Structure formats: structure tokens, C-alpha cells
Amino acid sequence: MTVEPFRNEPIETFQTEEARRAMREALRRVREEFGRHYPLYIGGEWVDTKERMVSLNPSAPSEVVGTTAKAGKAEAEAALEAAWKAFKTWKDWPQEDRSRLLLKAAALMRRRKRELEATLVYEVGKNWVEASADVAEAIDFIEYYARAALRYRYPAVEVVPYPGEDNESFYVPLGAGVVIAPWNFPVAIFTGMIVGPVAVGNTVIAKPAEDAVVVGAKVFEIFHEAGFPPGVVNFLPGVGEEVGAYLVEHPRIRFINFTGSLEVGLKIYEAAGRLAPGQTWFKRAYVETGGKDAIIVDETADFDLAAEGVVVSAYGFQGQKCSAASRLILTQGAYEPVLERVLKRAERLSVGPAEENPDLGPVVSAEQERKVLSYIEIGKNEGQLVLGGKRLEGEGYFIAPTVFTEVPPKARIAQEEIFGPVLSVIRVKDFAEALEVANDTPYGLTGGVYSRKREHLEWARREFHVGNLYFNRKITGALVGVQPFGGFKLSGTNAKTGALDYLRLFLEMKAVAERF
Amino acid sequence: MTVEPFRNEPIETFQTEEARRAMREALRRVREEFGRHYPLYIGGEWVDTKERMVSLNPSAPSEVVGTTAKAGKAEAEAALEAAWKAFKTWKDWPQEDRSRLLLKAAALMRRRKRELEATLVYEVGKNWVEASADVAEAIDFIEYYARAALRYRYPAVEVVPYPGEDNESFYVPLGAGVVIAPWNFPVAIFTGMIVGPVAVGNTVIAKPAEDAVVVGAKVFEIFHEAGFPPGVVNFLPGVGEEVGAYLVEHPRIRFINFTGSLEVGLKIYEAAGRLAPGQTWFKRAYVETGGKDAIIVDETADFDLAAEGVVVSAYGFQGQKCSAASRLILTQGAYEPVLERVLKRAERLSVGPAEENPDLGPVVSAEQERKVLSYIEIGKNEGQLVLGGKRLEGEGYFIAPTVFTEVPPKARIAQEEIFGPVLSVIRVKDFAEALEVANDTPYGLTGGVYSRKREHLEWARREFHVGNLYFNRKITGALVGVQPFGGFKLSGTNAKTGALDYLRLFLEMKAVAERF
Amino acid sequence: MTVEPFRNEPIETFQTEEARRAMREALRRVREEFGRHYPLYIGGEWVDTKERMVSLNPSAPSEVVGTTAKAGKAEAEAALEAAWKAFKTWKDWPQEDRSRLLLKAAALMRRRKRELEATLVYEVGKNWVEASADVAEAIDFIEYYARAALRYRYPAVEVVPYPGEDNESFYVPLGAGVVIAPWNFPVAIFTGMIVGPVAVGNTVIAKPAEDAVVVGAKVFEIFHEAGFPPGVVNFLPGVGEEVGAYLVEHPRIRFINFTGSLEVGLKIYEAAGRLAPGQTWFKRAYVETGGKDAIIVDETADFDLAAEGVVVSAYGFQGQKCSAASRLILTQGAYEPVLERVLKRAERLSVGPAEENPDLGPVVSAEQERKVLSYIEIGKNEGQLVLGGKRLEGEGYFIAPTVFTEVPPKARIAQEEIFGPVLSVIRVKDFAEALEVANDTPYGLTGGVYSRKREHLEWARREFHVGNLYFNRKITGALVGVQPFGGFKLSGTNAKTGALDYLRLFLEMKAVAERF
């Protein structure tokens, strides 16, 4: 198979009339379908259930954006039988044929990208550019994994020769496993976690987050139209601690690919370590969890650049990103100038229904709102509230861009993942202390430094212990292929998505010798 | 760093009078040194204790080969401080500097190889060639990992460039981890599991098997002479279920590299999945556990070639190998002619003290002996005893080569790892049925087919589900670099030793972007 | 598939007492087996006929080395059905599977090499070293083509990518073809012409030379033991102008791979260009035909080195090589000193039955003998006879080493391939005239220059118009891999044996585009 060198899908800015018109048309088409019901997808067919999942517009939660079927234990069992039955022949597909299937799904997705972005707007309250970058990342994952998979094709392993013998080592896929996905990148991450394992010959049961069941269904419409054989990808919307826990714990689940909270990640990794009755393997579990990400700014930085970058990182998608800057660590000389600039910028951010393309839309659910508001109550005790900190008017879950200052490094709001538009500002003496404070959390996902001092940047390269570090730019929006993505410590297992290494996680190796 | 391309260390066969002379002298000197005491090795110094580990000669268990110090909790804590402290600066060595240190350790081990072989003969009851293969394999691990580590050096990761930015991804070592090793390859596997992680910048606390603590101290004598900095490598002989479990479960242990019984490996892997109080990472655990390894023979095979490889595979080191043929699966037309040839060869095998270079020495301990004899009694009620089945006269732990035939595929002796000189012969109709029976165990480590039929060989290549498969040759003795070693299913986590992939298991990845 | 890098099979010289012992035993056993009957081999089974081919010992033609079955039209038809049917599934084998089958065939031939050399000594009158070179060359073809075939595997072709599309180009084998081989290298060339096409997925009907049918059956014994599927390779000893022509002209024959006389090669190539009734393709035909090969010597040469290489080149296997020096072109200052040295060396050559390991055995048949003696009589009227020119006493076909001097460049004996121990010496003024005379024949196979002058060597490199040119060494004995073998002009189609290019001749290319 020969295709163009990988390039990232362009993220639509909507600066042109044509792009704005195209988005308006998609928003309209999407909302005209708010009444749709999407069944489960099992063994190549849409299969409905008696019970259902309801999906709301977090910008107007009296508005239903759609409903899906609801998978319980029996549907989980049916998905298993279908996935294992498919694995038997899907594993034997030439790699070029599997890679071509992915390339088809990418092209189908690329043709439906405005519709997908409009679904993200309405279903999870992403503004226009956030939605665009989510869909573009999903496309990138498919394009990138299609190509990367060929690097593993029969027989890919470099071995030492031996006289009188052929020694052949090669990779094979593991089997059927479960993908359990978050609501916050419910096209991109949902899509990458599924197609990476599938590309190399594994089969997948995908469990979308409750808050994003509708857009996950539309991803499966693309999978179905691309023509994945029956049982290869299966769609099981349902309750995480029910159907998800059942599959994680199952003796016939071979691997688990998880992105989500640390709380859940810890349970999953623990259950994966256990031999379920009748299980005949050591389960592989990949769990990519949260962060408490910091940006450091020292007195040498471009303060305007820093402030813009901080505001993008802290408040993009209302701070509901594992990559979000939730801590701003400022050296003595950077403290006032950067903080004043951050407050000026952030106080100008608009908040409202996502479809109007505000700076911030709503947080995703009533539960998210309750959790973010509780952390704001905690923070009022721990630091100084200087901006926002309030629910805004309307039914939608609108929360103001929030800033706490004089936050002690060990405060709960300086330690725990709030996952909303809440920035904790920490004042430190110098760069060494800034690094100490950055490293001193259980987490290690993203981090940023604004500085013109080469020695500070190169020092951070070696000692700011996060899996994704950025200098003099935002810390969010890791691009497939460019910035392998994944963290250290309690940010997860360092499965680097959008990287050649990712596929190896879903392969095992056989070594066959023939003595002639 | 530029060295000669890797070549495997030649395995001495003691055919030349020169080799015999060298080996006699080495055995004499080791025997003359019986009763010697070896302390722990922690933070670069030999540290003694009040309690001791006693190492007996399984050929004459009245004889004390030597004793070691004994690590409990306090020594585990001292070793942990020493390893983490060492790690801080060891991780920053250039890869070339670390690789040269491995190369120096290999040159030193090679200079001491007759003495280390002699030590294995006396301590674990290896005959001369089995001892020579073990030491040569340990040399090979060091030479191989020294070179393979350079493939991962700063910055090794292939990324997509982005306008206006440098994007640099690179590998870093994990931290301090524990290595827990078996008695059956106490030089090769003990060395490989240590120097792999250490090559790429990790530090290691090493826990040798109770039955092989003396040869483990001698490997540490080599490390100490080579000049590994204080803390990089630590030697903690002790009780597996005491000090070993303590480290496996410790919040400050970063990874666990384990080779041994499935029973223990299940416990380690389960414990590794738990977050111990105060732990700040997801533990990595590699467990390579046993097998129930079969050789298939069909009627097209060279029956003399088969009989010979079966005997070598079944009985080499007394069947005490994770790779040993413990099942012989014979199609109907192969049954009589192969079984006859196997019985004729096996009844001529000599059994006696290892220093005499017999075909078989003793099993390793009174507990191994008890267990093997017990399985023999079980086997007597499951299949037909046609050879051996007896303890031999003498104080050493000598068990005659044993064959059961007409064994049911689901018999305990056809399913459970006996780890002794006990072969179970299974009669099947055809190659298709041969393959079903071969695959139908909890394990997936090694396998073999003797056949001249290309379609049967190529069928097995695709469907004989073992990590290490061999055609028309023995199924033991996988060579570093040539045959990446590791299994499927409950034979472990498929960490492939002596392959480039192995070292990636002890690294994590950082992605650092600078926007200019 | 990973094997050791290619190395040429060492050519036995029988200097060691061990080699002499092995060769004496092998000759004794072949001699003891005289009169054995070998059937055809078709669709994987040995198939006898009523008629037979008789194979005589040219050293004692009263002795029947053996007999074979004889293929006419019906057997050609059965072989065609078998080859096309085999082709349907053989073309779909992974390249690695087909290459391993070649490797197994090479290991088997190597194990039988003394017996095959012994068979050549008796059947075609090779002395021991000539027989050893022939078998070693056949081993080399298999080893070489097994590896070279992997360079062409799915999808091998380098193409330009295109937006929105996968473009995949790859090679497929042609079909079933006929191989028609000479008697003079009945192991090497017979094997190479067969296993080349077969390696990459073609099937072959093989027609050995009448004088070498016994050693051809023995090569087929090797194929059959190796396990080539029924139909992939078929053995049809028979009359070239009967069954050979029948296949060349058949509408269902896809390609023809031919080595032999120019006269036959002209007919084959002419017939291949015709569309037989109902034929659905343009036939491919490779014809490698004879030479009139010269060595040039100038006055700068080492005259002893030259005399020695000339004698080896002219007289090795009785001058019965397409590569043999049949012309010695001497500049004026080289004329006397080289001719004297050549005459002195050649008059010491021993001639006798091949089993005695003489310098020269007999020519291959009564017809070869008639033809060579007839050319000798022609030569007597064209140049000056200065050595030999006689039949020797005895029943075997023994002809003395023969030299003619002052031969006109346009003499029949200086133009036409005699294929016997007959050297024509031509006297020229200078290196320029040496080159004109060298180029002025219908042929362009092998050539040689002895000279120390760099400008003459480098001039010849550019302008001595032969496919295989050699400086300061013999011009026979081209090694697989080292010296791609094949000529220019009426020495054939320049299908270069033992080179990567050879296999491309038996493949065609498909280009498949998917627009996503």
C-alpha cells in the first residue's frame, strides 16, 4: 500500500463565509435530528434494547439531543461472542487490507466532519474550533494508525541469524478487548482507542461515555459504512460501573483500553491484575488518567505571549481537558505582570450556548457543575478568589472563568483535578522552586514553560517530569504524530497515542525456528 | 560506541582435552571453596547479616556449597534508599557510558566462565554442557543488551515535524525496581533480568532464588569489579514470600521483573495492579511463568531425528526448564515408531552426581524431588507408566527418566507443569487433532513439530499458539538475539528476552515541543 | 524469514584424506547402482512408461549408468494439467513459505553432494573437481534464489503516491512453463533454471538433456523429499526435438527457460514469438546459447599466470563449457612466450576415465566425439596443428588436448563453437587489434584479458563486448551472486543467472488503485 506521507488534518478556524455557512447548515441538520434513537451495534448490525440512554444539550438541558439503546450484561455477552468470532478471521487479514479499511473510514469521517463537529457542539458543549480540533484529531488517529500498522507487518522483527536455520519473528494481535472512553474528546479519543487495536488485527467492544452516546453512535455509522466485518467493532452505550465493569472483569476480555478519571483508572488497573475464574491470560490494561497540569512563567518570558497561552490552556473547552493548565506557577519577577495580564484577558472571555461559538460553553452535565462548584467552595477557603467563581444565568451549565491566587502548593485546589474553568496561581521564589512545585503532585501529564532563558528551558526538558511538555506555547491540543501523547505517575500507563509505539501495546510476538 | 556485530557466545561441549582440563581445574577449585560465605551487596558494599541462607549440593545434600547473608525488611529498605539515590545520577549517564559498563561486565564474566559453570554444576546440579549453555546465555544477554540499548538513545523517537516548532520525543528510564529470579537458570536469567533494565538507566534490587544464592553472589562479584556505581545493582538473597513479596508490594518499587512459577507470577501481577498506600504510579510487572510444552510428530517425520530432539528437550537439565518438552503428541502413523525410538534412547540415559557430567544430574532440592515423585504417583493413575518412575539410590535427588503413554489430554500430568524428568505421550489421529491437543492447555511457551510436510509446518507456524516454536529440532535452548524468548497465555506477559523489544518495557516516553 | 547472509558453497578439491575417502565411497556406491531405472515425476508421483531413455558412461559406453521413463505428448499433457492446477494455489503461498521450501531443498542437496558429484563423474564424464563445482553451483542457485525472491515480495514496487488514494503495485508469477536444460551442467543449470521461476510462484515442467537424465532424476528425488506440492515441479526426460518442441510450441505453455546450443535456441525463440492456436498471451523465452570465448594476452602480462588460466579455461571439462576459452588471441610480443608455456602445460594433461580424476575425462557421447573430430579435420586445413588433434585409444570418448596456431580470425574453427578440447591461437599486432578480433564473432558470452597495463584492462572493461569478462584469471566457473552470468549477441537473451534481475524475468506486475 502506497499513500501520501501523513499530514495532520487542518483545524477549521471558520474565518471564511463558506466555513461559517457550512457550519450553520450542519448545526441545522444536527438539531433537526435531535429526535433520533441509535441502537447498539453488534456483529455488523444495529440492535436495539428495551431500556435507553438519554443525551442532553448541556447548553439547554431541557433539550434532548438523542437517545441510544443501553447495553447490560446480555448485550455485553453478545458483543463478546461476536468479537471473538470476528477475531478468528480478522487477525488473518493482510495488514494492507486492514490499513485500507481504516483509510476508507478516515475519508468517510472527513466527509462528515461538519455534522460531527455540530454534534459535539450540541451534545458536549464544545465551541466551534474545539469541535473542529476534536474531529480533526479523530481523523488524524485513523490516518496515522493506518500507516503505523504497516511498520509491524509480517515478519517485522529484527533477529540474529543462525547457521542451518531460518529464524522468523513476527507480531500477532491479542484478541477481543474493551475500549472505555471519556465524554471530553468523544470523537478523537473514542476513535483512536478503537482503531489503533483494530488496525493490527484485534477486535473491539467500545463503551462510550454516558454524556456522549449520540456522537459515538455516529462514529459507528462511519465504521458501518466503511465495511468493517461483523464483530470487529461493536458499540455498547451503557453505564460505566455496570457494563464497563462487567467487561473489565470478564475472564474472556483480553485487553482494556481506558481513558478517563484516575478514580476509575485505579479500579480498572486493579481488576486487570486479577485472574478471573476460567481466565487463560494476563490481561493488558492501558489506563490514561487525569492531570494537574502547570504552566511556569519566569521573569524572562514574553508576558503577553504567556498570558494568551495560559488563558487558552486553562479555559479552552471550559478547562475540561486532561491537558488543561489548572496551575499557574509564577516566579517573584513574573508574578504581577503575568497575573495582571491573565486577569485582563480572562475577564473578557464570553460564556454561553456553545452553538454561538463563545470562548466558553457550558460544563458538560449537572454532575460536572456540582463538582466544579464544590471545588470553588473549597478554594475560597484555600486561596484568594480574584475572578469568576459563580454559576452564570440560564438553564445551561455555565460557569465563569475562575482564578484563585495565593494558593498553597499543597492545597486541594493545587493538587486535585477539578476539570472545570478554575486556575490556581502559585507564587514562587525562583525557577528551581517553580520546578519543585510543578513536580509535586501525584500526576505527570502536561506542563508548560514560558521563558527566554535557554538554561531554564533545557533544565525543564530534563526535570519537569510530565509526558508532554511545551515551551512558549499552549499545553493543550497535542497533535497526532507530532507530540506522542501520555503521562507519567498517576496520569496513567504512558501509552503514547499518535505514535508508532502505541500499536505495539496491542501485539504479541512469536518466534519460529526451522532447522533445515 | 563501535563494537563488533553481536555473535552468540560459543557453548562449550568439552570435546577437546584442553576444555576437559580447564573444566576439571575449575570444578576442583569450586569444590575446594565449599562452605564460603557471601554477604548482601547494597549501595556498592558487601553487607553481612546475623541470619543466613544455606546452599546445598543437590548431588550430595550433606555438602554445603556455601552460605549467604539474608535480607529481611530493613535490608530491603536500605537497598531501596541506595537504588533511588543511585537512580538520580545513573539515569543521566550517556547511553554509551552505560553500554561500555555492560561490555566490561561481559568481558569479566567470560574470563570467569569455567568457574561460574563449575558453580552451577555443584549448586543446582547441571551437567557440564547445561552449565556451559547457562553461563554463555548470561554473557549473551549482557553483550546483546549493551548494543540494543544504543537503539533507544536520545532522542530516539520518530515524530511528525510541525511548522515553527521543534518536537523532540525521547525515552527515559522508570526508576528503581525489583528483579526476582528462578533457580533453574541462576546465571542467565538472573543476569538478563538485571542488566536489561540497568542498561537503559534503571537501578535494580535483585532477589536470587533460595537454591541458587551462591552463583548469584558470584555474578555480583563481577558487577562490583566492573564498577557499577553504588546503588545501581543490589543483591538481596532471602525468602521469596518474605523479602520478595515485601518489595513487590512496596509503594516505592517502580517495576517488577519476574521469572518463575505461574502460582507466584499470578500473585505478583495481582499485587502490582494495586496502589499501595502512598504509591504515585502504576506499577509495571513482567512475569514470565511456566509452560506445558509439546512436541508434535507426524508420520512424515524423520523418526530418528525426532526421537533424539525429544529426549534432549524432555530430559536436558532433568526436565527442569520452562521450555522442556513435557508432552509428546504423536499422530497414529508416528505413534509406534517414535515411541520405540524415544524409549530406546531414554533408557540409555545416565543419572548421577552432576560433577561426573552424566546425562542427568539430580533435581534441585528435597521439595522438587517430593513434588516430582508425587506427580509420578498421580500419573500412574492417569496414563501408562512405560519407563522409570522411580527415585534412584543415593543421597542426591536422583530421579530416573520417566515416560507415561496413552495419557488423556486432560490428565493432570498432561496439563500441570511437573518440572522434572517426566514425559507424557499422547496418541492422536492426525495433525489437526495434534494441534488441538497442543493448544489446549493454560500455557503457550514452547512447542515443536517434527514433520517433512510443508503444509503441516506452515500450518503450525500460523496456529501452534506458543511464543517460541521450533521445527525439526529441539525446543529448548533459545539463543539470545536469534530466538526472542517469551510465551503466550499463562506462560506470562510475553516480555521477549534477547530482543530489541525487551528494553522498551523499562522505558517511558517524554514529548517536548518548543515553539520558536 | 531470517537466514545467514549468502555465501557460496565451497568447491571440494579432494586434498584432504577425509575428502578422498568420502568421494571413493560415493563413487563406489553410484557404480554399484548402475542400471537403476528412474521414472517420470508428474503431479507429485513417479510415473513410469513403456519406452525408455538409456544413459551411458562416456568413459566406458558399454556401461549403462541408468535408464529413465520417456515422456511423449500424453505425458507432456499430464504434466501441463498438473502444473497449471498446482499453479492456482502455489502462486498464493507467502514468499517466505516458498523460500523456506528452497532452503530445505538446498540442505537436502548438500547432504547428498558426494553422491551427486559421483553421479556426474559417471554420467557426463566430469573429473572430481568439475563435478564438485557443478553440484556446489546448484546449491548456490537454490540458496541465492531463496533469498533473492524475498526482495520481490508483496507489495515490492516503488510508486508515487496520489492524494486521496492508495496505489499499490506488486508482482505475480506468470504460470506454468517449460525448462529445457543441457547435459554439460546437468545439476547446476538444470536446478537453477527450475528453482528460479518456482521460488517466486511459477510451476515448471523440466526436460533434462538426453545424456544427463539420471542425475536429473536424482535432483527430482531431492525436490520430492523437500515436499514441493504435487504439480509445482515435473520431470520429463525425453527427446528434445519431440517432447521439448511440443511444449515450446504449446498454446498453454506460459514461458520457456532454455540453455543450450545456438541452433536450438534460435528455433525456440522463433517459435515463442508465434501465437499457437488458442494461445492467450505473448510467450516469454529466455535462451542462453553458446560462445566463442577468447582470452587476450599482451606483452605486459605475467606469462606463467596466463598460460595456466588459459589451460584451465580451454580444457576444464574437456572444453565442453559455454564459458570455455576456445580462442587465444596473442599480441606480437606475447605470441612466442605464451604459446610455448601453453603448449608445455597442455602436453602434460592426463586423459582417462573420469573416475580416475584425470585432467580431462571423455567427451560426453559418440555424437560429440564425431563432431569434435570433424572440426579437428576442418581446423587442419585452416590453421597449424601444434598439439594433439587425435582420438585416444579406448572405448570411452577420449580426445587429446588440441591446439591450432596461426588461425585466421575468420576461420571456421575461430568462429564456430566446437565444444571440445580444441584451442585456436590467433596472432595479432597489438591490444587494439586483439580487441577487434575478440569482438568479431556472432557471440558475446565470456572473455578474458591477461595484462598488467591498467589502460588496456580498463579499455577492455568498456569495449570487450562479452557479458562476463575476467582479468588475470580464468574465464570459466562464474560464481552465483558474485558474477551475474549471461551474454550478449547470439550468446543469448542476457538473462543473468545468479543475480537479483533473474527472478524478475518470471514475474509480471499489477497496479491497483483505490480511491477512498
Ligand SMILES: NC(=O)c1ccc[n+]([C@@H]2O[C@H](COP(=O)([O-])OP(=O)(O)OC[C@H]3O[C@@H](n4cnc5c(N)ncnc54)[C@H](O)[C@@H]3O)[C@@H](O)[C@H]2O)c1
Ligand atoms: N490521560 C488522558 O489522555 C486523558 C484524556 C481525556 C480525559 N482524561 C480524563 O478523563 C476524565 C474525564 O472523563 P470522564 O468523566 O468520562 O471519566 P470517568 O472515569 O468518570 O469515565 C470514563 C469512562 O469510563 C466509564 N466508567 C465509569 N466508571 C467505570 C467503572 N467503574 N468501570 C468501568 N468503566 C467505568 C464511564 O462510563 C466512561 O465511559 C478526567 O479525569 C480526565 O482527566 C484523561
Ligand SMILES: NC(=O)c1ccc[n+]([C@@H]2O[C@H](COP(=O)([O-])OP(=O)(O)OC[C@H]3O[C@@H](n4cnc5c(N)ncnc54)[C@H](O)[C@@H]3O)[C@@H](O)[C@H]2O)c1
Ligand atoms: N517463562 C520463563 O522464561 C521461565 C524460565 C525459567 C523458569 N520459569 C519458571 O520457573 C519455575 C521454577 O522456578 P522457581 O521454582 O524458582 O519458581 P518460584 O515461583 O518458586 O520462585 C521464583 C522466585 O520467586 C521467589 N518467590 C517465591 N514466592 C514469592 C512471592 N510470593 N513473592 C515474591 N517472590 C516469590 C522465589 O524466592 C524465587 O526467587 C517453573 O515454573 C518455570 O517454568 C519460567
Ligand SMILES: NC(=O)c1ccc[n+]([C@@H]2O[C@H](COP(=O)([O-])OP(=O)(O)OC[C@H]3O[C@@H](n4cnc5c(N)ncnc54)[C@H](O)[C@@H]3O)[C@@H](O)[C@H]2O)c1
Ligand atoms: N549460455 C549458457 O549459460 C550455456 C551454458 C551451458 C551450455 N550452453 C550451451 O549448450 C550447448 C551444449 O548443450 P546441449 O548439447 O545439451 O545443447 P542442445 O541444444 O543440443 O540441447 C539442449 C536441450 O535442448 C533439447 N533440445 C534439442 N532440440 C530441441 C528442440 N528443437 N526443441 C526443444 N528442445 C530441444 C535437448 O534435448 C536438451 O535438453 C553448447 O552450445 C553450450 O554453449 C550454454
Ligand code: PRO
Ligand atoms: O492534548 C490534548 O488536549 C488532546 C487530548 C488528549 C490528546 N490530545
Ligand code: PRO
Ligand atoms: O530456551 C531455554 O531453554 C532457556 C530458558 C530461558 C531462555 N533460554
Ligand code: PRO
Ligand atoms: O561459468 C561457468 O563456467 C558455468 C557455466 C554456467 C555458469 N557457470
Ligand code: NA
Ligand atoms: Na449528553
Ligand code: NA
Ligand atoms: Na543449592
Ligand code: NA
Ligand atoms: Na550419459
